[PDB]
Amino acid sequence: KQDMPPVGGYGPIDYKRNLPRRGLSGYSMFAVGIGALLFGYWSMMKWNRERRRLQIEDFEARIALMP
């Protein structure tokens, strides 16, 4: 008279399905995104506009001498 089922009580644990979480949806992206790309170029247009300022300085010595 030793058999399995307990006196009362159990779960259950469900079978259901959910795993949908976001995550900056629905045009929130395309908003930050195009915002970074610009600050990329604004970081250019200055380094590259400074480096030319040195470029001329370098061709200067060449023309300075060479008589």
């Binding site: 970074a36 790309l37 600050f39 990329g40 170029y41 970081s43 250019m44 247009m45 380094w47 590259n48 506009r49 480096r51 030319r52 040195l54 470029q55």
Partner: protein
């Protein structure tokens, strides 16, 4: 002693391509929930000395039906253009200084696929015959995706050499500004060098084993050591062409230290994928390039052309 600076390169790298094969299955081990080669090491770090020695003891058959003249000149390559391409590659000081050398990669990126077409044809019938033909066809259609999106940025830096490409990425990690492109610089080298998600060239699923099928232990170490001499180079390139380090005219050494702690992270990407995604069924494989990848790559080219001109930005070079 210029000849001892070379031979100090070819030798110390054949250890990486060797000991990658170990970190192949440790990292890909713990994705699976298990440990990696363990019993032999003690840590395993001793595995690859035992594996290099089983092949060349193990008898190297040739098919009775083959043309032996091609069955040599082909693999006698898969180990050149893999070890030549390394030459002009700054870290920080490249062994060669090539004026326009960036273009020189595409020269040696283009000339390897003409060592696939030999071997698979050199031997014999339809598993390596039409099976080495149609991995030609995908390997050349992922250049036009490439040379353009390599040529884009080079409008944004001024020249073809690599000593300028450390200067321009100074305090700007060149991945901000073109991040749309950078993605496609990644899926290319992963599609071109025959790696995980577009895997077809080397067979597992679509066929038995692509292009390796005939070589017994004897030659097949070379390819299995050639195919991993491309993969750690394009990925030791991408990070000179995107994620830049900061040269230091004083402690050159701290340049490479922080440089291998990037290029060695980056690589561990083609392993971090291969656990994950399935394959493409060769139609979808090219059919997604013309239609999809390409139209942009042209369109962006019409963009990075004007953006300097339209900002008085034009980078300081010839």
């Amino acid at each position: 002693m210029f000849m001892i600076n070379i031979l100090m390169l070819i030798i110390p790298i054949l250890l990486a391509v060797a000991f990658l094969t170990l970190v192949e299955r440790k990292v890909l081990g713990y994705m699976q929930l298990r440990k990696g080669p363990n019993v032999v090491g003690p840590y395993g770090l001793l595995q690859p000395i035992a594996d290099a020695i089983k092949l060349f003891i193990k008898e190297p058959l040739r098919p009775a039906t083959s043309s032996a003249s091609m069955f040599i000149l082909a693999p006698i390559m898969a180990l050149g253009l893999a070890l030549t391409m390394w030459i002009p590659l700054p870290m920080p000081y490249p062994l060669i200084n090539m004026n326009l050398g960036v273009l020189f990669m595409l020269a040696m990126s283009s000339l390897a696929v003409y060592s696939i077409l030999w071997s698979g044809w050199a031997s014999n019938s339809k598993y390596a015959l039409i099976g080495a033909l149609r991995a030609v066809a995908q390997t050349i259609s992922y250049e036009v995706t490439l040379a353009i999106i390599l040529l884009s940025v080079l409008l944004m830096s001024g020249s073809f050499t690599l000593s300028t490409l450390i200067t321009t990425q100074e305090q700007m990690w060149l991945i901000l500004p073109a991040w749309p492109l950078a993605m496609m610089w990644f899926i290319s080298t992963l599609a071109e060098t025959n790696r995980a998600p577009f895997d077809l060239t080397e067979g597992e699923s679509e066929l038995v084993s692509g292009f390796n099928v005939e070589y017994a232990a004897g030659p097949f170490a070379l390819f299995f050591m050639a195919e991993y001499a491309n993969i750690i180079m394009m990925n030791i390139f991408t990070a000179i062409l995107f994620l830049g380090t900061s040269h230091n005219p004083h402690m050159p050494e701290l340049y490479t230290i922080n440089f291998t702690i990037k290029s060695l992270l980056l690589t561990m990407s083609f392993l971090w994928i291969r656990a994950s995604y399935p394959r493409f069924r060769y139609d979808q494989l090219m059919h997604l390039l013309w239609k999809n990848f390409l139209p942009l790559t042209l369109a962006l080219c019409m963009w990075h052309v004007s953006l300097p001109i339209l900002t008085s930005g034009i980078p300081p070079q010839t």
